Structure 1
Amino acid sequence: EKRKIILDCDPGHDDAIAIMMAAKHPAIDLLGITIVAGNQTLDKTLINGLNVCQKLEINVPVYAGMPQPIMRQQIVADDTGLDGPVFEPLTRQAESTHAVKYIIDTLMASDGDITLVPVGPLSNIAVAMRMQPAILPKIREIVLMGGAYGTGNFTPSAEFNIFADPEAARVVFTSGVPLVMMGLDLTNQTVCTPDVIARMERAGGPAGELFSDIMNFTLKTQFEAGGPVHDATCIGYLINPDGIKTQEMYVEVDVNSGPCYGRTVCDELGVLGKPANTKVGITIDTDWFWGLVEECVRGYIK
């Protein structure tokens, strides 16, 4: 019944919303959290992830992974990477095991029922895949936040997570594992408005205060009217996939240097005649989604 997951992330404000949902909903069994460099350097995203788990009292092990992409000169986005909420001094620590080894070991010892949920650059995932290719058949599915079939964000062609490590993305998208891609085309619709925030503030508790603190800072909500929560859609998809419309496509990652480096090339119309390798997100029911967020928020209320 519960879907077992390993959440790989680079917190990151909206990774934090993903952690919050994943750690609470009865439909999800969050086994571990693995951290990768992305939004910021690994030292920072690690601290950010540990801070979220400490504040929400989430008792799930957190593992540090790759501090660099597998080949390219490292890029970050844009002080911490998660300003807004107030955190107390960090007393919680990472596990000693490197995230790549933890991913490999856990998959190898499993009964093949674990789903990987990458919502940062794909560096940890790619290194685990090439270090121990025996994990490939043990992965049930990969539900990732990344890419765009239309316009990207960091460049016109590329979405940040893919652009941060295109060669790692190429590994994942050529793995043969069942893939689900929550790309910008879908995530940009899942718009957090002042009403959504007010709604979570009212529910309250640790999860409600955190969501609000993150999004009030991020959307500058004293002023003009909202913006997206990308990574959390992956969690939503696992809780109820009927809330998200997908389309099966053949997707290829462009690792050419030049104007399409890190692009996800999606064969929308099927002109290449190749078998589809990815379920690509098209539209989301935002009424359903926000209801789910509030639900997860309420799960933390003592």
Structure 2
Amino acid sequence: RDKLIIDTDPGIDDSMTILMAFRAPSVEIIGLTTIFGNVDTKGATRNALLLCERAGCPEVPVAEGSHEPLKGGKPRVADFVHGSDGIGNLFLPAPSAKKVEESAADFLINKVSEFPGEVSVLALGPLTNVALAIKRDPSFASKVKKIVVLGGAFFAAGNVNPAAEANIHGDPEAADIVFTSGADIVVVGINITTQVCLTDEDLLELRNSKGKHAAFLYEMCKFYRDWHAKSDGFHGIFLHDPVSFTAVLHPEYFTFKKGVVRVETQGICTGHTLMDQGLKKWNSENPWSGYKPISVAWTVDVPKVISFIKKLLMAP
């Protein structure tokens, strides 16, 4: 079993990913660390605690992270995508289980330091907790086995605005700290996730399936699917957080390009992710020179990724 920490802002697709991860036998979830984005940090914590209870694992630690990005100030949350409660306006009763005392940043440092080179981090939200861990412990990057990042848009339009994807836009400074940290990183951008979809027909197949959480998953997805229809004009949902989970377990379902990634932190392109493939020899140094490259998902085997996700979502 591969040790995994999920840093997340649940969040409808985050919730699908967490429930899938609990059902994946080759994965050991050692904790959930929460962040703002789809909902405020306190809402993300409440949802993560409820997911642990729903999965029949209320002992799995939930560590609450930063309430604000690194630059400071109250974050604007995607309630128009994930609902006011962050799980598609289901307004469910509060969990009985409680979060741990330590912050998400300290939890990340402690678990990674306890098992060096063995713990993988799946980052499903803004990268604030991961960047805080990197800044507080400068050896953190070298100790984490792998960091799989759902975020960015590589030579494709963003979802916040043309320039930026939501997780990166939520904390550009944190994202730039993570991408330049020297850790073994895999980045799954919008250029990849828009290729992997669950149509309305696929969602009905889930509702009618024998899946353990099929009814709950279908109910959350109604609001999420509605946003895709209203904004993207797509009748179904894009699978973003479940695609990054697929990249943890089955990196062979993708092809990757190695290159230095930088994040724009100011101006009209705040939150923009840009990779240097290194195919052109630059005449002089630039912001991409001297950093360690990271792995950027370039292609995706769509039938293989869809098959793997459907199998986990519909497992009894």
* TM-score relative to the length of structure 1: 0.91
Is 1:72–1:165's contact at 8 Å kept on the other side of the alignment?
A: no
Q: Structure 2 CA distance, aligned partners of 1:222 and 1:76?
A: 20
Q: Deviations over 1:215-267 (max 9, x none)?
A: 23322499992221211111111221121222222211122x21111111122
Match of 1:135 in 2: 140
Of 256, 260, 281 in structure 2, the residue corresponding to residue 246 of structure 1 is 256
Q: Structure 1 CA distance, aligned partners of 2:189 and 2:306?
A: 19
Match of 2:16 in 1: 17
Match of 2:305 in 1: 289
Answer yes or no: is 1:235 the counterpart of 2:240: no
Q: CA deviation at 1:72?
A: 4.5
Distance 1:6 1:12, change over 3 A: same
Q: Deviations over 1:146-201 (max 9, x none)?
A: 00112111121111111111111111011001111111000111111022212322
The aligned amino acid for 2:163 is S
The aligned amino acid for 1:133 is P
Match of 1:175 in 2: 181
Match of 2:70 in 1: 70
Q: Choose 191-200 or 145-154, whichever is displaced more.
A: 191-200
Answer yes or no: is 1:55 the counterpart of 2:60: no
Distance 1:86 1:69, change over 3 A: closer
Is 1:55–1:87's contact at 8 Å kept on the other side of the alignment?
A: no
Q: CA deviation at 1:14?
A: 0.8
Answer yes or no: is 1:101 the counterpart of 2:106: yes
Is 1:243–1:288's contact at 8 Å kept on the other side of the alignment?
A: yes
Q: Structure 1 CA distance, aligned partners of 2:27 and 2:176?
A: 28
Q: CA deviation at 1:206?
A: 3.3
Distance 1:203 1:272, change over 3 A: farther
Q: Structure 2 CA distance, aligned partners of 1:42 and 1:154?
A: 19
Match of 2:236 in 1: 226
Match of 2:267 in 1: 258
Is 1:142–1:179's contact at 8 Å kept on the other side of the alignment?
A: yes
Match of 2:41 in 1: 42
How big is the alpha-carbon RMSD for the aligned residues of Structure 1 and Structure 2? 2.3
Return 5+ residue gaps in structure 1 as ranges. Answer: none
Is 1:193–1:227's contact at 8 Å kept on the other side of the alignment?
A: yes
- How many residues in Structure 1 have an aligned counterpart in Structure 2? 298
* 1:5 aligned counterpart, secondary structure: strand
Is 1:142–1:178's contact at 8 Å kept on the other side of the alignment?
A: yes
Match of 2:286 in 1: none
Return 5+ residue gaps in structure 2 as ranges. Answer: 283-288
Match of 1:80 in 2: 85
Q: Structure 2 CA distance, aligned partners of 1:199 and 1:265?
A: 38
* 2:206 aligned counterpart, secondary structure: helix
The aligned amino acid for 2:210 is G
Distance 1:86 1:75, change over 3 A: closer
Match of 1:279 in 2: 295
Give me the identity figure in percent. 27
Is 1:32–1:61's contact at 8 Å kept on the other side of the alignment?
A: yes
Q: Structure 1 CA distance, aligned partners of 2:148 and 2:39?
A: 22
Q: CA deviation at 1:98?
A: 1.5
Match of 2:285 in 1: none
